[PDB]
């Protein structure tokens, strides 16, 4: 009949793929995913808000602050709290840093998943400096919680923005050298141009989000249409793709890195010295000096860490432009100290839904290039 | 830095960026550790004789959701929002 290959969990991420292929050029591929299933939604249902914030930190794991930002803005949207301006600007700066990190890992792991070895090492030296910044800010290497609902917790120490300025200059030169290395590299252009075309009608019906909508025509940015924070005050532009190519989508990711450099530059130049957290002791914990020499601050610290703050009853769905796309969180909260049911819209899940139309008329090396060309981490796809 | 001239010239010639000035090894503009200790300001709270919590009671302002329609010569047919404007090309080099 036809060859029903079973690509197991070995490395060409981690999945299982059963492809009923015709003859080096396929027929019917089915991704069996769910191998990395953990039980995040049931665990958040049996825990509180502040305690189950790290589940939202690590359900996606390459992006590490946009997922925190999405859950914290879900809770701050439901709880009716505007965060202070310096918290909003630090949240914007770290959103752009995490965006730069996720796009550069997607570029390098797509290059290594094809087989090119060296810009992986170059840009991972750059991402080692990124993790040095995360270490100095929070204390963690990767999984900095750091974003409480109620603003940024424990603001950045003195002597950081100069290092971010130096990193901005050197990283602009390094991404220019990446475009020098690849990108009009002839064999790589031969590797990926005409594979995985996506009609914009199918991009809307199959529910593609983020970079796929940029590549397949239609102009759609959450940062431009629905400013959920101080993005309306920083000036940037989004790149759009003419043809539905993979090469086009690569160019779009590189130019989103470059626009992240612009937003980091303006955010450094326009920092207000407002405050760390909100002006409400019943949501954010009070600082430790007032805790020690104050009665009400000790009472609010004690109850706010045992019971937690309550949330008024209601349901909300917010979604922010994570580097993979519209990362969505839908909270349903009975009026209590625990959420009733949370659910996560994953752009990687929505992109992996259309794998049939992205790999109908191509070969299997192009199937590996299609799996690589969408920033799919297989921990977020699981929910 | 602190390399000799010949390999510096071959680095500059094999990639024409004048690579010496920006090379990503940090030498002197590492931020000087053990900074002086900070005093952190307090924002729009703590001002005495206005901080009634009934004013900024952001939790209790959350009203229940309003409803209508249920189970129990007219210019109309509204949209949920005004229609979205077509964007314009930015000026910072539109065709990269």
């Amino acid at each position: 009949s036809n060859l029903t290959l079973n690509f197991g969990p070995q490395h060409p991420g981690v999945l299982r793929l059963v492809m009923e292929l015709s003859g080096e050029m396929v027929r019917k591929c089915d991704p069996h995913i769910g191998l990395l299933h953990r039980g995040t939604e049931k665990l958040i249902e049996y825990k509180t808000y502040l305690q189950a914030l790290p589940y939202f930190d690590r359900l996606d794991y390459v992006s590490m602050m946009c997922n925190e930002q999405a859950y914290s803005l879900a809770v701050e949207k439901l709880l009716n709290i505007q965060p202070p301006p310096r918290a909003q600007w630090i949240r914007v700066l770290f959103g752009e840093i995490t965006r730069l990190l996720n796009h550069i890992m997607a570029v390098t792991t797509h290059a290594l998943d094809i087989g090119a070895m060296t810009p992986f090492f170059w840009m991972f030296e750059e991402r080692e400096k990124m993790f040095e910044f995360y270490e100095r800010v929070s204390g963690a290497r990767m999984h900095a919680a750091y974003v409480r609902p109620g603003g940024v917790h424990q603001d950045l120490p003195l002597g950081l923005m100069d290092d971010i300025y130096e990193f901005s200059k050197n990283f602009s030169l390094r991404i220019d050298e990446l475009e020098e290395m690849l990108t009009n590299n002839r064999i790589w252009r031969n590797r990926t141009v005409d594979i995985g075309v996506v009609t914009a009608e199918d991009a809307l019906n199959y529910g593609f989000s983020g970079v796929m909508l940029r590549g397949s025509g239609i102009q759609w940015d959450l940062r431009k249409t629905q400013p959920y924070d101080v993005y309306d005050q920083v000036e940037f532009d989004v790149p759009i793709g003419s043809r539905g190519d993979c090469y086009d989508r690569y160019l779009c990711r590189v130019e989103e890195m470059r626009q992240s450099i612009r937003i980091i530059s303006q955010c450094l130049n326009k920092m207000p010295p407002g405050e760390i957290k909100v002006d409400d002791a019943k949501v954010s914990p009070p600082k430790r000096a007032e805790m020690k020499t104050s009665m009400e601050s000790l009472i609010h610290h004690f109850k706010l860490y045992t019971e937690g703050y309550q949330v008024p009853p209601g349901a909300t769905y917010t979604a922010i432009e994570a580097p993979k796309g519209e990362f969505g969180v839908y909270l349903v909260s009975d009026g209590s100290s625990r959420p009733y049911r949370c659910k996560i819209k994953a752009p990687g899940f929505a992109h992996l839904a259309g794998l049939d139309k992205m790999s109908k008329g191509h070969m299997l090396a192009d199937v590996v290039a299609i799996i690589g060309t969408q920033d799919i981490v297989f921990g977020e796809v699981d929910r | 830095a602190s390399a000799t001239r010949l390999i510096q010239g071959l680095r500059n010639w094999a990639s024409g960026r004048d690579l010496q000035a920006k090379l990503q090894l940090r030498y002197q503009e590492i931020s000087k550790r053990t900074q002086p200790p900070p005093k952190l300001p307090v924002g729009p709270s703590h001002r005495l004789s206005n901080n009634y919590y009934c004013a900024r009671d952001g939790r209790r302002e959350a009203m229940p959701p309003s409803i209508v329609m249920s189970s129990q010569s007219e210019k109309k047919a509204v949209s949920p929002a005004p229609p979205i404007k077509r964007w314009e090309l930015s000026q910072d080099e539109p065709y990269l």
């Binding site: 603001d155 200059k169 920092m271 | 005093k39 952190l40």
Partner: peptide
């Protein structure tokens, strides 16, 4: 006083343009 981290009068420019020599 206050001891936050603002920039010192505004930082310099950071380039954001694709640089190629086309040699």
């Amino acid at each position: 006083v206050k001891q936050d981290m603002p920039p010192v009068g505004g930082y310099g420019p950071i380039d954001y343009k694709r640089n190629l020599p086309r040699r």
